[PDB]
Design a protein around this ligand. Structure first.
Ligand SMILES: NC(=O)c1ccc[n+]([C@@H]2O[C@H](COP(=O)([O-])OP(=O)(O)OC[C@H]3O[C@@H](n4cnc5c(N)ncnc54)[C@H](OP(=O)(O)O)[C@@H]3O)[C@@H](O)[C@H]2O)c1
Length: 349
């Protein structure tokens, strides 16, 4: 058997704690030389780190749809890789495949049914985009705007995006334009991120929530009020944005990342005063889970790919190399180290 590398859950940061590299541990294991029927053996190419992973580090995730990682047991999540051998009928050597439950391990044997074959033509050979803008986060943004945004052509709505330079947010804000908003405004945590948004991703305006006065800034940037709020962050920023939303406007409730290191239910409730404004202005704020919309993934991916291949959709990702950097990359992502999608390159390939 060959010796490969592996990441396991070393320790829990606690429900109110910050996630650290050392919550994860590298190990070496043997990879069997034989596989069975229905199984395939894959070389891992890229792994995703994602904010929903935060809850899996707690003993309870607080939801059926997600189970907690176990200590000393290998961690798993979004991944893309290439088949090195298969005894699964629909899969053969050289196929590129993805899984939501890819073990953080350099080579791995999996059940052939848990995989889906991807077409590199969609991403122009840039496989990592399948875990970002042409994957789950891109779908979340496009489908979210579609199902919850209530943007019509012929309208000239203003959209605001929180977490606007992360995976979801960088994409959401371009889709906003594509779908006929007349104004898209971004809130992110760095000056460098604001530049990306206004100069590369074509956001009409960019605000830094750490160094700026968000409210004053939204007033200048959203002179007609906010009709759509694509919300990835929650907390105090969402409070500012909602205070300035128009009547019958819409919050796309994507994530609430500022709350992820706190012991509080999801989704958290608006404060009494902000809830009051929400009800008074007939603002919609419904829970959005992309996984409830599986049968729109096809068109979704086809659309995003199409926009990318037309030069319309701009894809940003931040790549770190090496399986022994998963922990560090998750920490970096949780604390705004990533521009666009945080991706880990597992292979010398
Ligand atoms: N509803 C669904 O089905 C679904 C599917 C995918 C993702 N999500 C949600 O979408 C959001 C973003 O996910 P993502 O994959 O696109 O990750 P990401 O945005 O690419 O990266 C996470 C970012 O959140 C920002 N952030 C972290 N802590 C913050 C705080 N306390 N206050 C304000 N901003 C903070 C950081 O950038 P800054 O420097 O800008 O602070 C960081 O880069 C999350 O809430 C996630 O859970 C929902």
């Amino acid at each position: 058997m060959m010796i490969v590398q592996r990441v396991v859950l070393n320790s829990r940061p606690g429900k109110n704690g910050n996630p650290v590299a050392e919550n994860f541990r590298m190990e070496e294991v043997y990879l069997p030389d034989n596989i069975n029927e229905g199984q395939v053996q894959v070389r891992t190419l890229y792994l995703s780190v994602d904010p929903y992973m935060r809850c899996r580090m707690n003993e309870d995730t607080g939801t059926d749809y997600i189970t907690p990682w176990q200590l000393s047991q290998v961690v798993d999540g979004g991944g893309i890789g290439i088949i090195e051998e298969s005894k699964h009928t629909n899969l053969t050597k050289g196929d590129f495949v993805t899984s939501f439950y890819w073990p953080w391990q350099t080579k791995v044997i999996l059940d052939g049914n848990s995989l889906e074959k991807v077409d590199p033509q969609l991403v122009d050979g840039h496989l990592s985009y399948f875990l970002g803008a042409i994957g789950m986060p891109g779908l979340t943004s496009l489908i979210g705007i579609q199902e919850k945004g209530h943007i019509t052509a012929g309208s000239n709505k203003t959209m605001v995006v929180s977490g606007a330079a992360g995976a979801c947010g960088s994409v959401a804000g371009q889709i906003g334009h594509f779908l006929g908003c007349s104004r898209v405004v971004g809130i992110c945590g760095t000056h460098e991120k604001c530049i990306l948004l206004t100069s590369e991703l074509g956001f009409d305006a960019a605000i830094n929530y750490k160094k700026d006065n968000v409210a004053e800034q939204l007033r200048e940037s959203c002179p007609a009020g906010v009709d759509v709020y694509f919300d990835n962050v929650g907390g105090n920023i969402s409070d500012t944005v909602i205070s300035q939303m128009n009547e019958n406007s819409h919050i796309i409730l994507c994530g609430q990342i500022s709350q992820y290191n706190k012991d509080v239910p999801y989704p958290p409730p608006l404060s009494p005063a902000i809830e009051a404004i929400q009800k008074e202005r007939n603002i919609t704020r419904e829970r959005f889970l992309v996984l409830n919309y599986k049968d729109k993934f096809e068109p979704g991916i086809l659309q995003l790919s199409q926009w990318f291949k037309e030069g319309k959709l701009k894809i940003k990702e931040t790549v770190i190399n090496g399986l022994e950097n998963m922990g560090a990359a998750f920490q970096s992502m949780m604390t705004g180290g990533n521009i666009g999608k945080q991706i880990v390159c597992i292979s010398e390939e």
